[PDB]
Design a binder for this molecule. Structure first.
Ligand SMILES: CCCCCCCCCCCCCCCCCC(=O)OC[C@H](COP(=O)([O-])OCC(O)COP(=O)([O-])OC[C@@H](COC(=O)CCCCCCCCCCCCCCCCC)OC(=O)CCCCCCCCCCCCCCCCC)OC(=O)CCCCCCCCCCCCCCCCC
Ligand SMILES: COC1=C(OC)C(=O)C(C/C=C(/C)CC/C=C(/C)CC/C=C(\C)CC/C=C(\C)CC/C=C(/C)CC/C=C(\C)CC/C=C(/C)CC/C=C(\C)CC/C=C(\C)CCC=C(C)C)=C(C)C1=O
Ligand SMILES: CCCCCCCCCCCCCCCCCC(=O)OC[C@H](COP(=O)([O-])OCC[N+](C)(C)C)OC(=O)CCCCCCCCCCCCCCCCC
Ligand code: SF4
Lengths: 83, 57, 70, 49, 95, 155
């Protein structure tokens, strides 16, 4: 405890550069997991369409996908509009 | 008599250490120099233009 | 008296101003008044060719509105 | 108003040196445009300010 | 050539001191270049009596280097008493 | 007339030289220290166009300022030979004008001219930082009065 705190204090005095790099470098590894927006970040990347949403043939029994790009059914992203 | 010139041991208090750490990280004495020259930029130049005016004897 | 410094940077201020002024106006002049088109991707480049083909005068910066079609 | 004071002070410089032509003469030939007081003029034509 | 007060603060603030109290450029505070005629003093020997050179010379009072031993118990003696270690300053100790 | 255009090109060339001559960083002795006072803010040599560039490959006027001695005379002439054309050498101070105080000693060359073609001579021991300030400007008048192309068009 006392040795550890003194070693930090001796570091912070002898060198302020690597401790600052080690500190902010250390954080850059941990909070990405704890962040509650990282699952949102992948959703944003998934939302952005670079290729065409190629249509698929109808054979019945397909309620999920819409028949028109205005129908209420289908994947909607009003979460991202407010976000 | 004589006066010692430079052996001033810096304090190791957390305030002093952070002050030195801020000084090293956020360059301050370098900025102190820049502010110095800028102040010494808006002065009046000591030059005199030649023969139209001449130095004092 | 520090004012004498200003004439030096004054002409310099104009000197760096000419390039950005030139490029913007040259682009505005050559490209039919409109700002020069940017083609960072094939879709933009493909779009530019279609404009040139439908222009008839072989010039991308000649946009024909609804009066072209029936 | 010190800005406009030094502005009008420079204006008294150009008027003091016999108008614009005299101002350009001393700027191009004497390199300094400050006005002074004629304390004397020698026989050879050198004005002493 | 008097600086505008606006930049008087700028030069003062940027250097953290009052320049206008004492400037490097000189001004009317200098001593006048024309001064009244001075009357210089006389020396101590400018006496019109009892100023004989025999009791005033300095050159003719130097003897030849005194000789103390020539190649032609006693206590140990240093050339001079050892110096006394200088005391620390009073007006300004350790910087 | 071709004389007119030659004279106009004459004035153009020398004016560039006299307003941009660069005194070398060549100091010797007592005569050099006050020459710094010329470069000091009091007189500000740089305001007259000159810059104190080292490296005789990039200098015009050589300020021989101080006592010129035997052991260095080869070094100076090597330095002078390295200077490109045009090159001028202002003998500055009485030591470099003939030997100065030590004219009669055993290891001083009596005069900088015996090694180098010496231009305008500025006297003084030392010449005041202003005394050769005229010396530099008086050389600028010498540069002004040259003919060069005028001789070439009449050669
Ligand atoms: C940055 C520039 C901002 C705009 C101009 C204001 C400015 O720089 O004022 C300088 C002016 C002059 O310097 P100073 O040391 O205060 O003057 C002391 C004596 O009064 C000085 O006494 P003086 O007798 O020397 O005053 C006469 C002087 C007065 O000179 C001026 O007032 C300079 C402005 C042009 C006239 O004019 C001359 O000497 C004539 C020669 C002028 C040379 C060319 C000037 C070019 C200006 C820029 C052109 C466009 C680029 O300083 C101020 O007025 C301080 C305010 C600065 C405001 C900055 C706002 C941003
Ligand atoms: C030993 O002894 C010594 C002395 O004494 C003998 C001295 O005195 C002194 C004291 C004197 C001093 C000045 C003190 C400093 C001197 C030193 C030697 C100390 C060491 C110096 C340094 C560490 C710093 C050195 C700094 C330098 C050299 C400054 C450099 C920067 C500058 C801005 C200055 C130079 C500027 C120049 C040359 C002008 C621009 C250059 C051009 C080429 C001109 C422009 C050209 C063109 C545009 C090209 C043409 C094209 C055109 C016109 C375009 C149109 C045409 C087309 C075809 C396109 C010292 C110290 C000394 O030790
Ligand atoms: C941009 C610059 C535009 C103007 C350039 C003008 C030409 C300058 C060239 C360099 C100086 C030489 C010159 O002017 O003519 C060469 C002429 C060439 O003929 P010259 O005979 O006079 O050359 C000098 C003498 N000798 C040959 C012995 C070296 O030289 C001179 O004018 C210098 C005198
Ligand atoms: S001329 Fe005089 S000042 Fe110059 S180097 Fe010789 S002795 Fe020194």
């Amino acid at each position: 405890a006392g040795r550890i705190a003194s070693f930090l204090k001796n570091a912070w005095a002898k060198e302020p550069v690597l401790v600052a790099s080690f500190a902010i470098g250390g954080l850059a590894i941990i909070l990405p997991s704890l962040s509650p927006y990282t699952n949102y970040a992948i959703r944003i990347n998934r939302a952005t369409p670079y290729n065409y949403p190629v249509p698929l043939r109808d054979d019945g029994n397909m309620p999920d996908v819409p028949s028109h790009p205005q129908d209420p059914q289908g994947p909607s992203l009003e979460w991202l509009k407010n976000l | 008599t004589y006066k010692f010139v430079n052996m001033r041991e810096p304090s190791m208090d957390m305030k002093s250490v952070t002050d030195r750490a801020a000084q090293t990280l956020l360059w301050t004495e370098l900025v102190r120099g820049l502010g110095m020259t800028l102040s010494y930029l808006f002065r009046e130049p000591a030059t005199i233009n030649y023969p139209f005016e001449k130095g004092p004897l | 008296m520090w004012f004498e410094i200003l004439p030096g940077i004054a002409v310099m201020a104009a000197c760096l101003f000419i390039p950005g002024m030139a490029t913007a106006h040259i682009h505005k002049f050559t490209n039919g008044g409109k700002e020069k088109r940017v083609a960072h991707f094939s879709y933009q480049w493909n779009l530019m060719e279609r404009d040139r083909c439908i222009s008839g005068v072989n010039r991308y910066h000649v946009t024909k509105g609804l009066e072209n079609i029936d | 108003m010190e800005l406009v004071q030094v502005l009008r002070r420079g204006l008294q410089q150009v008027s003091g040196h016999g108008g614009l032509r005299g101002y350009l003469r001393v700027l191009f030939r004497a390199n300094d445009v400050r006005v002074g007081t004629l304390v004397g003029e020698d026989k050879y034509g050198n004005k002493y300010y | 050539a008097s600086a505008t007060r606006v930049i008087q603060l700028l030069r003062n603030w940027a250097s953290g001191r009052d320049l206008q109290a004492k400037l490097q450029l000189r001004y009317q505070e200098i001593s006048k270049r024309t001064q009244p005629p001075p009357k210089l003093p006389v020396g101590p020997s400018h006496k019109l009596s009892n100023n004989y050179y025999c009791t005033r010379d300095g050159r003719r009072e130097a003897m030849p280097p005194s000789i103390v031993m020539s190649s032609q118990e006693k206590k140990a003696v240093t050339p001079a008493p050892p110096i006394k270690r200088w005391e620390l300053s009073k007006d300004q100790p350790y910087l | 007339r071709g004389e007119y255009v030659v004279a106009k090109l004459d004035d153009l060339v020398n004016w560039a030289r006299r307003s941009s001559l660069w005194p070398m960083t060549f100091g010797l002795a007592c005569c050099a220290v006050e020459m710094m006072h010329m470069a000091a803010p009091r007189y500000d040599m740089d305001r007259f166009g000159v810059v104190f560039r080292a490296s005789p490959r990039q200098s015009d006027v050589m300020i021989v300022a101080g006592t010129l001695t035997n052991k260095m005379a080869p070094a100076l002439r090597k330095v002078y030979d390295q200077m490109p054309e045009p090159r001028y050498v202002v003998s500055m101070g009485s030591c470099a004008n003939g030997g100065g105080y030590y004219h009669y000693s055993y290891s001083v060359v009596r005069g900088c001219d015996r090694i180098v073609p010496v231009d305008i001579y500025v006297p003084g021991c030392p010449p005041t930082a202003e005394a050769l300030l005229y010396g530099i400007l008086q050389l600028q008048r010498k540069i002004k009065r040259e003919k060069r192309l005028r001789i070439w068009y009449r050669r």
